[PDB]
Design a binder for this molecule. Sequence first.
Ligand code: HEM
Ligand SMILES: N[C@@H](Cc1c[nH]c[nH+]1)C(=O)O
Length: 413
Amino acid sequence: SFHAELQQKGKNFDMFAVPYQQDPALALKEFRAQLPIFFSEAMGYWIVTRYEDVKAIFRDPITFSACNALEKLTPSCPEALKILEKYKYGMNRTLVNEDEPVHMERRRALMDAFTPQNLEEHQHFVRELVRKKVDGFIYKGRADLVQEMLWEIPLMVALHFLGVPEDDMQELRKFAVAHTVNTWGRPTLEQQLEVAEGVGQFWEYSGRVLEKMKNNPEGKGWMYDMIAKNRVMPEVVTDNYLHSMMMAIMVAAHETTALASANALKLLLADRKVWKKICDNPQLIPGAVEECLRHSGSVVAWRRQVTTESEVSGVKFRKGDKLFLVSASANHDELHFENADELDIYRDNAIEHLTFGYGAHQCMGKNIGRMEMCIFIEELSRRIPDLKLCEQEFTYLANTSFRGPEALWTEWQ
Ligand code: HEM
Ligand SMILES: N[C@@H](Cc1c[nH]c[nH+]1)C(=O)O
C-alpha cells in the first residue's frame, strides 16, 4: 500500500505545505517515479510532474489554454471583491494568458522590440547599474545582495525597457507583492483586504501611467510600442489589453529576473568548486546561468486550463480541468536530465529546461533575464572572487509558482 499511500499523498498534495515550500522538485520526486500525473483535491488542480508531459501540454495551446495563467488561485472573499469594484479593476487578457487563434499570436507577432540591437543597448545599461551598485557596497564586509542590487536593478531595467518613468520603487515593489500574493498565494484573512487594496491601487496606478504615456507619443519603450500598435490595430492590441498588460508586465518584466538571479548566486556561491571555475572562466557563466535556470529557476509551476476532453500519458482531462505544470519537477526529471538534482554547469542540454515555458507562450523576455543574470555573476565573481554565503536561514514568499530567497546574506574581504 506504498502506492496506495502515494495516491493519498497526491490527493492531499498542498503546495503551501512544508515540503513543496522547501523544495518543489524534491516534493514531487516520488510522484515523478510512480504517480506522474495526479489530481490534488487540496488545490483543485491536476499536478503534472514529468518533463515529457509538461512539454506536451505546453506544445498544444488549443487543448490546453493559458486563460487561467493569471487567474487568482484562491477565491476572493466578498469584501475583497468590492475593494476591487471600487477601483473598477478590469484585469483580463494580456499575452501570457491570452488564448487565441493568433489573437495571442497576432498580438505577439506584431510586437517585437526584442531585437538584439535594442537588447544590446539595454545590456550596456544593466552593466552600468551593476558596476555602480557594487561600487557602493564593495567596501562593506557583508551585505544582503537582495537589498543591495538584486531586486532594485531588474526593476529599473524593466521600467527602462518599458516606457515607464521611475518613481517610488518601494511602492512599485509592494505593488508587485500584492499582485503575486493575490494571484499565486494564499493570503490570510487579515491580509486579503490589504492585498485587494494593493491590487486595486496597482490597477489605478497603471491606469494613470498608461494615460500619460498615451499623451506622449515621443516615447520610446515597449509600452509605447503597444500604445502605438493600438492606434493602428485596436482590434488586436485592445485598450483593455493595454491596461491589463501595463499592470501584469510591470511585475513580470523584473520580478522573475530578480528571483532567478538570487537563486543562481545562492546555487553557485555554495559550490566553491563551481564558483572558482566561474571566477577563473567567466566564459562559463552563460552555460552556468542556464543550468541555474534549469536547477532552481524562478518559475517553478505554471498553469493551463483544459478546453476539450483530452488525455496525457493515460490520464483523461475534462473540459475545464485546471492543470499545474510543475516545471521545477520537469527540470529534475531523471528521464530527461542525467543526475538531475546535481548542479553541472555544462550539462549539454541544460537549455532544454522548461523554466521559460515552451512553444506558443514561451517567455518573450528570456534573453533579458539571461543577460541580467550573467552581468550580476560576472561583476560579482570578477571583483569579489572570495564571495561566500553567510550562514543564514532562507525564507520564501509562500506561493505556488514563483521562487527565490527573500534575503541573500553574503561576505568577503
Ligand atoms: C528569469 C526570468 C523569467 C522567467 C523564469 C520567465 C518565465 C516565463 C514563463 C514560464 C512564461 C510562460 C511560458 C509559457 O506559457 O510557455 C513567460 C512568458 C512571458 N514572459 Fe517571462 N520570464 C522571465 C522574465 C521575463 C521578462 C524580463 C520579460 C519582459 C521584459 C518577460 C516577458 C514575458 C512575456 C511577455 C511573456 C508572454 C509571451 C506569450 O504569452 O506569448 N519575462 N515567462
Ligand atoms: N509573471 C510571470 C509570467 C508572466 C507574466 N506576464 C508575462 N509573463 C513572470 O514574471 O515571469
